[PDB]
Amino acid sequence: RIRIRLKAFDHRLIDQATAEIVETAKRTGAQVRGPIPLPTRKERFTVLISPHVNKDARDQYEIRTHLRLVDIVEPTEKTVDALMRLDLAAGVDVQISL
């Protein structure tokens, strides 16, 4: 089957990464469910903004980690080899799982 899960920080970089990996699989050797979303992890941080005193004043930050799934339901020979050695898309982590 091969559940392909991939995640990134930018919401509109991962979209074309999920579109290209599906298209280099759907077209080349059939079968795909789709871009399954999953919940976004929002790791927040609340650092003191000044170098000394002034506890009230802080800045708040976050890093939206956007997950995505693919899910194919047949181990095709054209598709399985296209996943390996043919990903690219920088700033987008990917983890194929059999």
Partner 1 sequence: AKQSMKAREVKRVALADKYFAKRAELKAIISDVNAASDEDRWNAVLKLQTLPRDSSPSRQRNRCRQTGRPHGFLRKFGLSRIKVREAAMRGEIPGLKKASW
Partner 2 sequence: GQKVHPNGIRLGIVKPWNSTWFANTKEFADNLDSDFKVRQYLTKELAKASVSRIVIERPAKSIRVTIHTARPGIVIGKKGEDVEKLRKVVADIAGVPAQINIAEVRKPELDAKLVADSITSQLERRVMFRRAMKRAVQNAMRLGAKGIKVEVSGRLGGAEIARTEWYREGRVPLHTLRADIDYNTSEAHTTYGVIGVKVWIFKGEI
Partner 3 sequence: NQYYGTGRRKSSAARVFIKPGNGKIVINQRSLEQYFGRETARMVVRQPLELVDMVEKLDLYITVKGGGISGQAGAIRHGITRALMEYDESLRSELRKAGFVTRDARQVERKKVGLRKARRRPQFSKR
Partner RNA sequence: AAGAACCUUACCUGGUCUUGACAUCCACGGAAGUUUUCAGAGAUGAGAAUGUGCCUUCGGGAACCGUGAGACAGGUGCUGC
Partner RNA sequence: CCGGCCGGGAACUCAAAGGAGACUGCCAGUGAUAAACUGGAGGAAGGUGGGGAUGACGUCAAGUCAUCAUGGCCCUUACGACCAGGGCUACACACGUGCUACAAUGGCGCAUACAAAGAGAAGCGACCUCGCGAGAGCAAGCGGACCUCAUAAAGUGCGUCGUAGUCCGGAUUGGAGUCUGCAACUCGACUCCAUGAAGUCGGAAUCGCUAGUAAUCGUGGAUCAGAAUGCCACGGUGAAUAC
- Binding residues for partner 2, rule: CB under 8 A, are 7-10, 87-93
For residues 80 and 25, give the distance between their C-alpha atoms in angstroms, rounded to a whole number: 8
Pattern of binders to partner 3 over 54-83, x per CB under 8 A?
-xxxx-x-----------------------
* Residues contacting 28, CB < 8 A, separation 6+: 78, 79, 82
Q: Which residues of 3-25 are buried (b: 16+ CB within 10 A; e: fewer)?
A: ebbbbbeeeeebeebbeebbeeb
Residue numbers 24-53 binding RNA by CB under 7 A:
37-46, 48, 50-53
> What SS3 state is found at 36?
strand
Please choose which of partner 1, RNA, partner 3, none residue 37 contacts, taking the beta carbon within 5 to 8 angstroms, the exact cut-off set by kind.
RNA
Nearer to partner 3, 28 or 50 (CB): 50
Distance of closest approach, residue 97 Cβ to partner 1, in angstroms: 24
